[PDB]
From a paper:
[name] integrates multiple functional domains into a single ER-membrane-spanning protein. The lumenal domain senses unfolded proteins in the ER through indirect and direct mechanisms: as a result, it undergoes dimerization and subsequent oligomerization. The association of the lumenal domain promotes dimerization and oligomerization of the cytoplasmic kinase-[name] tandem domain.
We then co-crystallized a more potent allosteric [name] activator from our SAR effort, G-7658, with [name]-0P and found that it superimposes perfectly with G-1749, except for an increase of approximately 0.5 Å in distance from E612. More potent allosteric [name] activators of [name]-0P, such as G-7658, inhibited [name]-3P only partially, suggesting that perhaps certain compounds experience mixed binding modes in the presence of phosphorylation, where their tail can be accommodated in either the front or back pocket. In an alternative scenario, an upward conformation of the loop in absence of phosphorylation in a B2B dimer can increase activity of the [name] domain. We show in our work that this kind of activation can be brought upon by small molecules such as G-1749 and G-7658, but whether this modulation is physiologically relevant remains to be seen.
Residue numbers in the entry:
A (entry chain A): 562 to 579, 582 to 655, 663 to 714, 733 to 743, 749 to 878, 880 to 886, 893 to 922, 924 to 964
B (entry chain B): 562 to 579, 583 to 655, 657 to 715, 733 to 744, 749 to 885, 893 to 964
Write the structure that this text describes.
Amino acid sequence: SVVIVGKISFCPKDVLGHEGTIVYRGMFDNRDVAVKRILPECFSFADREVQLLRESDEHPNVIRYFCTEKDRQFQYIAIELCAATLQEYVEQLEPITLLQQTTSGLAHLHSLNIVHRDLKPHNILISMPNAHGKIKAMISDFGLGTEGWIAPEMLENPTYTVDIFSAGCVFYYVISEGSHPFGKSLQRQANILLGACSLDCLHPEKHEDVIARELIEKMIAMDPQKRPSAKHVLKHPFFWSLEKQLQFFQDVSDRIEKESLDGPIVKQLERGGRAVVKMDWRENIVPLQTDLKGGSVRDLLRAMRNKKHHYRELPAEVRETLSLPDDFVCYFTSRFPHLLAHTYRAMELCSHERLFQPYYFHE
Amino acid sequence: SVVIVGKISFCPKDVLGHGTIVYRGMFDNRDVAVKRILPECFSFADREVQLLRESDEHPNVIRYFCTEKDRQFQYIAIELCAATLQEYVEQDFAHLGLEPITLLQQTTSGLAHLHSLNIVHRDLKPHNILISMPNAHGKIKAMISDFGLCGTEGWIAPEMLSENPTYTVDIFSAGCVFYYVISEGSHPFGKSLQRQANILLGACSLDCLHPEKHEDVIARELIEKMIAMDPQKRPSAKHVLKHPFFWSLEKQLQFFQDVSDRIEKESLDGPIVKQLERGGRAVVKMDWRENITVPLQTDKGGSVRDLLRAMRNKKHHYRELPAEVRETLGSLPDDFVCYFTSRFPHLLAHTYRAMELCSHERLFQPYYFHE
Ligand SMILES: CC#CC(=O)Nc1cccc2c(Oc3ncccc3-c3ccnc(N[C@H]4CCCNC4)n3)c(C)ccc12
Ligand SMILES: CC#CC(=O)Nc1cccc2c(Oc3ncccc3-c3ccnc(N[C@H]4CCCNC4)n3)c(C)ccc12
């Protein structure tokens, strides 16, 4: 059989999940949709739920709301039918992109003065492929038995920094492919209050991890004033493409070319530089060894610029050990996993300069 | 007072446009526009809605909400917009700080989306292109509508009058819309009722685009291809999007550098400089060293290759330059690239089609359309 409450329709046989409510797979205007059926004891709550959807669903990374239908008994809410929740996606295509999409959607809600107050993999939906094979993450259940993803300040009028904490956990959740910064499921919320966090799955030698935890650690700070805004998060190197990373290493190598070692830039750039270059970055390269100091971070950055700018007019032997765009920068980041994370945090002195505005965040 | 048909509701007093009639209505407490199709067109409406559903997920394609049947007539509810592109160019609406290039960019993006779904618009014109209400951030956008269906013409490609069309049809229509937006009312093929007849003939004119303004040289280069009488010579939607017509001032500058760097180690007798110098004297205004302002003249004036290099090292070594010269060139990257394009309005157009040999090299693939 099939139930009908106006334009919405669904078969009670097909249930998708569940307060005292149920969610069915149904139809609306011959679209595939997920229909949430709710009891009369939540109509005052649903009208507020639908209100939020009508205002905020005009963004690709926010779940698309179609229609609601009141009946003699239960009320119904039609949402875009999705492939899976983020929880199912992990507990059963590209991770950085989902987090970028998720964070983008989150940044959107914050810009409309809307706090999610309960961001977690269950609320993050993964669309069906869109005739071009593209899947995307979409926020939902925003602005409204255990926990595990709640900020410690919420043990009401929360600020945006709350959702950031929740996202920071989600970030580690997708990269770790299941883990959580504050431990196993039932253990999380208690460890959150106690500030017991662990990023064990992120190794210190892996480049991608050094970048990630630099971001996440800030996102899951116990002091809300230290967490970055959603827009801030999006600009972090964690989301940069390999071309952008390499372009960041090139632009910085230009700014330093006219800078003296007595300047505050090289001072911060060489601060703890001995560890970034692995004592001597010359001992961690063979064909590329023929350069014609080895403890200076600056020189390493000067090296990659030159070999990139002259990559065309370079020996096939050198071009071999070094492709042009992605494999080139991977030569350095892989052999010097702290290079980008260090270069990025040191060059923040130029965060206001036009040349670095696309790399750093400030209104 | 208020006609309610299922979920859709509207006051018949508020007619938005005209045998279908379009009212300002409501659906699910959303502001919407309601098209009332008559019983003699229920077969066409079912096709119209079908397209709206499959082609809904794109920010530059009109958003479709719901449809409600009724014994009197069918109803179709879409997003309520501020105005059609026509209304904007005609009259009032000439404000809101609207960027013409951004509208054409948005329009073309929506079109590329329709094409990728194997849909031909068959009738793209300013009346169809709707201008959204400003969002919470005061941003508005263009959205395509009335696409894929089978009162005068003027925006129709010449092949469709002489059974189904190809993507290149919508390109001709777009090319005319480009001119219409830039010229703020004009049309390559003349006045309203004159257009379609001029289209069957070869009677087109872009005289609003002068060869002096650097923007107009770019606009002309693109549009002329888009409105070509021969369909096989028209760019695809995604091809149009790659054109310099849409490049930012930063990307225009970033282009001259990747070009200059590429020709740095190149011989002046090669096939890549001779192409760059092919008619180079006119690009540099006989001698570019004379067209330069008094200050910058201090730091081969008949070679485009040297001009790119001159702009390159001027940028690469900008941080270390005189304050007087820094005033002449201007602030990077916007005012700095406009310093040269203003005085050499054929440089960009020249350098672009010249460097099209490296359209498969990855350093230039972002600048050129390819399979
Ligand atoms: C303010 C505000 C708000 C808001 O958003 N209120 C919601 C309305 C309707 C459904 C919702 C919703 O929906 C589901 N709630 C529980 C379980 C499953 C689904 C759901 C939704 C869409 N699609 C799918 N697809 C299935 C296919 C089989 C594999 N699992 C995923 N499931 C979620 C989560 C969250 C919020 C929902
Ligand atoms: C396949 C397929 C398809 C498809 O899209 N089928 C359409 C359905 C409903 C309305 C449409 C439509 O709608 C209008 N048709 C005529 C006149 C006005 C409007 C209209 C629509 C939305 N908003 C506004 N706002 C007014 C506000 C006052 C200034 N003028 C614009 N007008 C247009 C054009 C074009 C197509 C429409």
